[PDB]
Design a protein around this motif. Structure first.
Motif, short mmCIF file in Angstrom:
data_model
loop_
_atom_site.label_atom_id
_atom_site.label_comp_id
_atom_site.label_asym_id
_atom_site.label_seq_id
_atom_site.Cartn_x
_atom_site.Cartn_y
_atom_site.Cartn_z
N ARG A 114 0.84 -1.18 0.00
CA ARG A 114 0.00 0.00 0.00
C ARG A 114 0.88 1.24 0.00
NH1 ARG A 114 -5.51 1.20 -0.59
NH2 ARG A 114 -6.78 -0.56 0.19
N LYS A 115 0.49 2.26 -0.77
CA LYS A 115 1.13 3.56 -0.58
C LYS A 115 0.80 4.08 0.82
CE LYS A 115 2.41 5.97 -4.24
NZ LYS A 115 1.72 6.09 -5.56
N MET A 116 1.81 4.13 1.67
CA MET A 116 1.63 4.33 3.10
C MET A 116 2.31 5.63 3.49
SD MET A 116 2.31 1.44 5.92
CE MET A 116 1.45 0.49 4.69
N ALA A 117 1.59 6.49 4.17
CA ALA A 117 2.17 7.72 4.72
C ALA A 117 2.72 7.46 6.11
CB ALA A 117 1.13 8.83 4.76
N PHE A 118 3.67 8.30 6.53
CA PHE A 118 4.08 8.26 7.92
C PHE A 118 2.92 8.66 8.83
CE2 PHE A 118 7.93 9.00 5.54
CZ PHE A 118 8.79 8.07 6.10
N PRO A 119 2.90 8.18 10.07
CA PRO A 119 1.95 8.71 11.05
C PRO A 119 2.22 10.19 11.22
CG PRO A 119 3.15 6.78 11.88
CD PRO A 119 3.89 7.30 10.69
N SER A 120 1.15 10.97 11.32
CA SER A 120 1.26 12.42 11.17
C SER A 120 1.21 13.17 12.49
CB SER A 120 0.15 12.93 10.24
OG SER A 120 -1.15 12.68 10.75
N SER A 163 -9.35 4.93 7.47
CA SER A 163 -7.90 4.93 7.57
C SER A 163 -7.44 3.85 8.53
CB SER A 163 -7.40 6.28 8.06
OG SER A 163 -7.59 7.24 7.05
N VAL A 164 -6.38 3.15 8.16
CA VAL A 164 -5.72 2.16 9.00
C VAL A 164 -4.43 2.79 9.49
CG1 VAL A 164 -4.58 -0.06 9.15
CG2 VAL A 164 -6.68 0.16 7.79
N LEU A 165 -4.25 2.82 10.81
CA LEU A 165 -2.96 3.16 11.41
C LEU A 165 -2.25 1.84 11.66
CD1 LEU A 165 -0.87 5.15 12.53
CD2 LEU A 165 -2.07 4.96 14.76
N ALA A 166 -1.42 1.44 10.70
CA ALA A 166 -0.73 0.16 10.81
C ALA A 166 0.35 0.23 11.87
CB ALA A 166 -0.13 -0.25 9.46
N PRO A 211 3.32 3.09 15.87
CA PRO A 211 2.83 3.39 14.52
C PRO A 211 3.89 3.14 13.46
CG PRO A 211 2.36 5.19 16.05
CD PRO A 211 3.30 4.27 16.76
N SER A 212 3.51 2.38 12.43
CA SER A 212 4.32 2.20 11.23
C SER A 212 3.91 3.14 10.10
CB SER A 212 4.23 0.75 10.75
OG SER A 212 5.39 0.38 10.04
N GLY A 213 2.61 3.31 9.87
CA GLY A 213 2.15 4.11 8.74
C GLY A 213 0.64 4.19 8.75
N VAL A 214 0.12 4.98 7.83
CA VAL A 214 -1.32 5.19 7.73
C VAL A 214 -1.70 5.21 6.25
CG1 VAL A 214 -1.05 7.70 7.89
CG2 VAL A 214 -3.26 6.65 8.43
N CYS A 274 7.74 -3.63 4.00
CA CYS A 274 7.84 -5.05 4.03
C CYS A 274 8.33 -5.64 5.35
CB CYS A 274 8.70 -5.52 2.88
SG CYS A 274 7.92 -5.34 1.28
N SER A 275 9.01 -4.84 6.14
CA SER A 275 9.53 -5.29 7.38
C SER A 275 8.91 -4.68 8.62
CB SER A 275 11.04 -5.17 7.39
OG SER A 275 11.48 -4.00 7.94
N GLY A 276 7.91 -3.86 8.43
CA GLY A 276 7.22 -3.19 9.49
C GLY A 276 8.02 -2.34 10.42
N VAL A 277 8.87 -1.46 9.93
CA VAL A 277 9.56 -0.59 10.88
C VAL A 277 8.58 0.45 11.41
CG1 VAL A 277 11.64 -0.89 9.45
CG2 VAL A 277 10.47 1.39 9.52
N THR A 278 8.81 0.87 12.65
CA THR A 278 7.87 1.68 13.41
C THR A 278 8.56 2.94 13.92
OG1 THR A 278 8.40 0.37 15.39
CG2 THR A 278 6.45 -0.30 14.08
N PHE A 279 7.75 3.92 14.33
CA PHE A 279 8.28 5.19 14.84
C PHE A 279 7.71 5.51 16.22
CE2 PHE A 279 7.27 4.86 10.46
CZ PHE A 279 8.49 5.01 9.83
#
Ligand SMILES: *C(=O)c1ncc(Br)cc1OCc1cc(Br)ccc1Cl
Ligand SMILES: *C(=O)c1ncc(Br)cc1OCc1cc(Br)ccc1Cl
Lengths: 298, 285
Positions: free
Chosen positions: A4-10, B110-113, B119-122, A293-298
């Motif tokens: 999925r085109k995934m954005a960073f958590p904002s 929206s999914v907050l993966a 949090p990884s992404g949204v 693909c590796s699920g890195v997190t912030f």
């Protein structure tokens, strides 16, 4: 599973978004420590934007002419200065929500997330690439100016929105435009745009990782002859080096994936799809693919 | 202008994500008020669960809940359907205004993966008509939530399982979307059709942004052949019709003939009418 085109958590960026008003003009600004950053065209009137003399327009402004709201609270402005095309308003309170942050100038073909904002309030978040021609294909309405782009516990701000040309243009946080653009309402040519080859390659790797292998069947100097022909960016050894990890994780050599892509370019996709797209996608970097693909997190 | 698959801002959800550990099983939970919600399969080992029997062997102290560095104290555990509810001794000071909501097929969120409470992404998903979602979910994403925002977060989805292909989960009351159960078995999702009213909303978005070429007048007969959800859907599409002066279904020519629309070589069905309007007019939160 899935890609999925995934954005960073904002969240860390949301706590930095403020509203900046000057005259009738209102747009978004970025509040870090005791400085608020925004496009200098906040000072332009309707008539000014055709050919603004920013030095002379700013001279007519005082600190109290700049209204800055962070929610219901109003910040008081105690100094104003212009740095290239961004205005810097000193305010008397440092943002309590300031994250660890850096200011970065990205390279064309790199990706970032955009927190589209209006009246200092977030509207949505999405992932963008800086096109080779330094424009970005975004979603920006009237009033979105001052929305920022970023990568991530430390936020790297790389982009501030300044103008809709149907494509979008703006600056780093030092106020230097990406590309040839100037902040005036004139027609301005963007370059000939090209596809970000290393990214299409990275995305083909993600495809193989997720089970789409139907496209899997050259030399660097030879592939580049094909890339040039199809308005693709040339592939360098640097790009091949950055594709290293994905080549190892997947076990397909980069010049082999390049032969696959050459075939896709010379032959098209035959109505098939790759990761649910009927076009080659170039807005994933090799880092993005790995990140996801590796699920890195912030 | 421009048109992008836009996710809601994720900050209000990020402050709600926690790590939940039971045995040697860890996944994500959602901390709201003094309650943490997570998939009940957190209590399952690797070796067809009898969840009531498994839960009976579990006490409050077998559940470890972490919020960042802080560790919460569980003081109660119930099972509502397929969610565990762990009552903790601390209300989440970052609890946003919120509702639990059960969405309908074709609606978006929206999914907050997340992995390990972080949090990884949204990204934006649509609930497919067959009640799966086509997301990006690795082992560990279980407990991630789907949501819409109106200052109020409506939680609609908790991630429970990666099928062979796609994704499935529940509402925040633990009722699965679709015919699925929280068990590692092959589980069929039925045939999945295209969300017709969404494709139409996207065509309006296309016209609003200047993509004109696809404009060329029960005749649903075509939709049935191309596996499109049957076209009340007109009433929802009303305001877009009023904005553009165009209900367009004659998409019929698109289906039979097959260039790009809004930069896609495929008809897109993960924008609702509300999504198009939100985006094309600058709705904020
Ligand atoms: C741009 O996003 C924007 N939003 C709101 C407002 Br009130 C103004 C604005 O910029 C308008 C603009 C800027 C430039 Br550098 C060139 C042309 C135009 Cl129309
Ligand atoms: C699912 O996202 C997930 N992540 C991490 C962990 Br430790 C477990 C987990 O669920 C595994 C699962 C759940 C179900 Br309801 C069915 C099959 C499987 Cl493999």
């Amino acid at each position: 599973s899935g890609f999925r085109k995934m954005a960073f958590p904002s969240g860390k960026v949301e706590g930095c978004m403020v509203q900046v008003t000057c005259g009738t003009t209102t747009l978004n600004g970025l509040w870090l420590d005791d400085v608020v950053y925004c496009p200098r065209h906040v000072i332009c009137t309707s008539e000014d934007m055709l050919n603004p003399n920013y030095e002379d327009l700013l001279i007519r402004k005082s600190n109290h002419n700049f209204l800055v709201q962070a929610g219901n609270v109003q910040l008081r402005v105690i100094g104003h200065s212009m740095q290239n095309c961004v205005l810097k308003l000193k305010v008397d309170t440092a943002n309590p929500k300031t994250p660890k942050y850096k200011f970065v100038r990205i390279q064309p073909g790199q990706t970032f997330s955009v927190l589209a904002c209006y009246n200092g309030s977030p509207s949505g978040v999405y992932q963008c690439a800086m096109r080779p021609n330094f424009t970005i294909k975004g979603s920006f309405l009237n009033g979105s100016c001052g929305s920022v782009g970023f990568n991530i516990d430390c936020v790297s701000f790389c982009y501030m929105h300044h103008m809709e040309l149907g494509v979008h243009a703006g600056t780093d946080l030092e106020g230097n435009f990406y590309g040839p653009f100037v902040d005036r309402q004139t027609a301005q040519a963007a370059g000939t745009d090209t596809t970000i080859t290393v990214n299409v390659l990275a995305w083909l790797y993600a495809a193989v990782i997720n089970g789409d292998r139907w496209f899997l069947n050259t030399t660097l100097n030879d592939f580049n002859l094909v890339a040039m022909k199809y308005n693709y960016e040339p592939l360098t050894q640097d790009h091949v080096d950055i594709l290293g990890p994905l080549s190892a994780q997947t076990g397909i050599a980069v010049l082999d994936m390049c032969a696959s892509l050459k075939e896709l370019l010379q032959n098209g996709m035959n109505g098939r799809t790759i990761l649910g797209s009927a076009l080659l996608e170039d807005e994933f970097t090799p880092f993005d693919v790995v990140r996801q693909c590796s699920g890195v997190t912030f």
